[PDB]
Structures are given as structure tokens and as C-alpha cells.
Ligand binder design. Structure first.
Ligand SMILES: *C/C=C1/C(=C/c2[nH]c(/C=C3[NH+]=C(/C=C4\NC(=O)C(C=C)=C4C)C(C)=C\3CCC(=O)O)c(CCC(=O)O)c2C)NC(=O)[C@H]1C
Length: 311
């Protein structure tokens, strides 16, 4: 239970230091990672309200031209199924996904937060069964953690995949590791609570996967930065393209990590730990594979719950 959020920087909030890690409002950076584009739209009218400044890279129209258009005009085919898929009241973790054939393929991911639709666009291009069975069949916690890390590494090609388990003081230990020789080994290494601060842990119980595809890439602003509906920040906790905390970006660069991704392990509604993945170079995992990893995280969570109850 951290101290309350600071305002974000663009609303005059303080820049974060090691004295106040937990107060960074990481869910409302007003910016995205440059491997995709993000638009926000009115949930009733479909008016495009905010556009990431790099949108032309992915959509072929400048932000100023996109802004003010409706999703009916921009996405004729998707808008009705979108209108049908995401009416008011739904969980903000609920997703609509589609593939757009853009002259070559864009993955569209849409979620609703209150009266706003958040649209994420990024390039896209029988083994899940075997992964699920492997996790189900592990007869003890050690075996389960080994299978989880090995399976995730196999599926993703990440240089290093670890299982990070939280202690009651919110310090953590890496208790399983699958890696390329000789990525630095963190197996058995322990880390302070502040490295994964309490507002991050809280967010990670609500939105179960997040990533930084390129730890040296500059964030791309949303324009306008505030949602015109509310004159308030746009909630991006459920957007995988959300810019990552600069403090964490620096942590990763200092570790020689070019790309990072984690998946929550949730037991009894608490953050038990994280599947922590690193690559030394930048690395973008395809959207469909992210969905697979989320499924694997849920399965892992349920198996950890099961095996701990048996003890
Ligand atoms: C004062 C602020 C600091 C800071 C804040 C911070 N950290 C995160 C997110 C993560 N931290 C993680 C920690 C580890 N990754 C590893 O490989 C190890 C051990 C070797 C540790 C301990 C992880 C896994 C994450 C999740 C994100 C990811 O998977 O890449 C945040 C939130 C980031 C975000 O979602 O935007 C914040 C604010 N970290 C510090 O050490 C201090 C300086």
C-alpha cells in the first residue's frame, strides 16, 4: 500500500528519485513505445480524440489528419464489431482483437476504459497443448518452476527467462532460470523491494503482462496528452504499448538488457511473483505469442496455488 501517486510530469508532478519510487504514476505516462501506434476514441461517437505522434508510420496518415475522424470512417469493418464487442461497463482488461490488412499486416487491440476506447496497432506476422500439459503435470513446485522457465524460453527465444518469487517483505529471489550460456546468472540472487515498487506490484495484479521492447527507444507522446472528455490523463495501465517508467528503463540498460517482458503470477489475489524475460538486444514479441504467454501465466498461477495448498 504505497504513498499516493504524484501527478504526472506534464501536470507538474515531481520527477522520481530513489526516495519516492512508489509514487510514480506509471499507468498515465501520456506516451507509448515506438514499435506500435495508439489512438483513443470516444466510446459512443467513435471520434478519434488522441493520436500517438508516430501514427503515420503505421497508419499512413498524419496525427492531425486522424484526429477528429471517426472510427466509422477510419475502420469501416471493425467499428461495428468493435461497437458490438465493447459497450460500457465491461472489465477494462477485456480485449477486442483483429488483424488489419494494410498495404503488410497490423494487429489491432482495443480495450475500453470508462467512456474511452484505447486502440493499439502493431505489426503482426499445437505447442500450447504441450506447454499446458507440462505445467499441469509438474508434481512439485521446483519442477513446476523449471518447466515454466524452460517452456517460456522455448516459446519466445528470450536470452534469459527467470521466475522471481516475492517474500512477505516484498524482496524477491530468482528461484528458477533458463538462459543462454553465458547470460549473467541471477539464479539464487536476491533483490530489494524497491526494484519492483508497490504501485507497480499493484498494477501487475490488474494487468498481467507488460514489456519494454527496446530499452533505449524514446517514448512517443500522445497528442493531445490529456483526454478531451475529462481534461485528465488517459489511463494506459491496460495498454501493452504504454511507455515504461524511465527509472526501470535505466535499470534494464544498466543490466545490459535491450528488451524486457514479464508476466504476473497471481495467487489468492496477491502478486506471488513474476516470469521475468530478458533479451540482450531489442526484441519485439508478436501479439499472438503475448496472448499465449498470458495463458501460460494463468495456468502457472493456478498450479502454484494448487501445489502450495497441498503443502
Ligand atoms: C525508484 C525506482 C526504481 C525502480 C522502479 C520500477 N521498477 C519497475 C518494473 C519492474 N522491475 C522489475 C525488477 C527486476 N527485473 C530483473 O531482472 C530483476 C532482478 C535481476 C529485478 C529485481 C521487473 C521485473 C519489472 C516489471 C517490468 C518488466 O517486466 O520489464 C517499475 C514499473 C515499470 C513499468 O511498468 O512501467 C518501476 C517504476 N526500479 C529500481 O531498482 C528503482 C531505481
Amino acid at each position: 500500500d504505497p504513498l499516493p501517486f504524484f501527478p504526472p510530469l506534464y501536470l507538474g508532478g515531481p520527477e522520481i528519485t530513489t526516495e519516492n519510487c512508489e509514487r510514480e504514476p506509471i499507468h498515465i505516462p501520456g506516451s507509448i513505445q515506438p514499435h506500435g501506434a495508439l489512438l483513443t476514441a470516444d466510446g459512443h461517437s467513435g471520434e478519434v480524440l488522441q493520436v500517438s505522434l508516430n501514427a503515420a508510420t503505421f497508419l499512413g496518415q498524419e496525427p492531425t489528419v486522424l484526429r477528429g475522424q471517426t472510427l466509422a470512417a477510419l475502420l469501416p469493418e471493425q467499428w461495428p464489431a468493435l461497437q458490438a464487442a465493447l459497450p460500457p461497463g465491461c472489465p477494462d482488461a477485456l480485449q477486442y482483437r483483429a488483424t488489419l490488412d494494410w498495404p503488410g499486416h497490423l494487429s489491432l487491440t482495443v480495450h475500453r476504459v470508462a467512456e474511452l476506447l484505447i486502440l493499439e496497432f502493431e505489426p503482426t506476422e499445437h505447442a500450447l497443448r504441450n506447454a499446458m500439459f507440462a505445467l499441469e503435470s509438474a508434481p512439485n513446485l521446483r519442477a513446476l518452476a523449471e518447466v515454466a522457465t524452460q517452456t517460456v524460453r522455448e516459446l519466445t527465444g528470450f536470452d534469459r527467462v527467470m521466475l522471481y518469487k516475492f517474500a512477505p517483505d516484498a524482496t524477491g529471489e530468482m528461484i528458477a532460470e533458463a538462459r543462454r550460456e553465458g547470460m549473467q546468472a541471477f539464479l539464487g540472487h536476491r533483490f530489494p523491494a524497491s526494484h519492483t515498487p508497490a504501485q507497480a506490484r499493484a498494477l501487475y495484479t490488474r494487468h498481467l503482462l507488460r514489456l519494454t521492447a527496446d530499452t533505449r527507444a524514446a517514448a512517443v507522446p500522445l497528442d493531445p496528452v490529456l483526454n478531451p472528455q475529462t481534461n485528465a490523463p488517459t489511463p494506459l495501465g491496460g495498454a501493452v504499448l504504454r511507455a515504461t517508467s524511465p527509472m526501470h528503463m535505466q535499470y534494464l540498460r544498466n543490466m545490459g538488457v535491450g528488451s524486457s517482458l514479464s508476466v504476473s503470477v497471481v495467487v489468492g489475489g496477491q502478486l506471488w511473483g513474476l516470469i521475468v524475460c530478458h533479451h540482450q538486444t531489442p526484441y519485439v514479441l508478436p501479439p499472438d505469442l503475448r496472448t499465449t504467454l498470458e495463458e501460460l501465466g494463468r495456468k502457472l498461477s493456478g498450479q502454484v496455488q494448487r501445489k502450495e495448498a497441498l503443502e
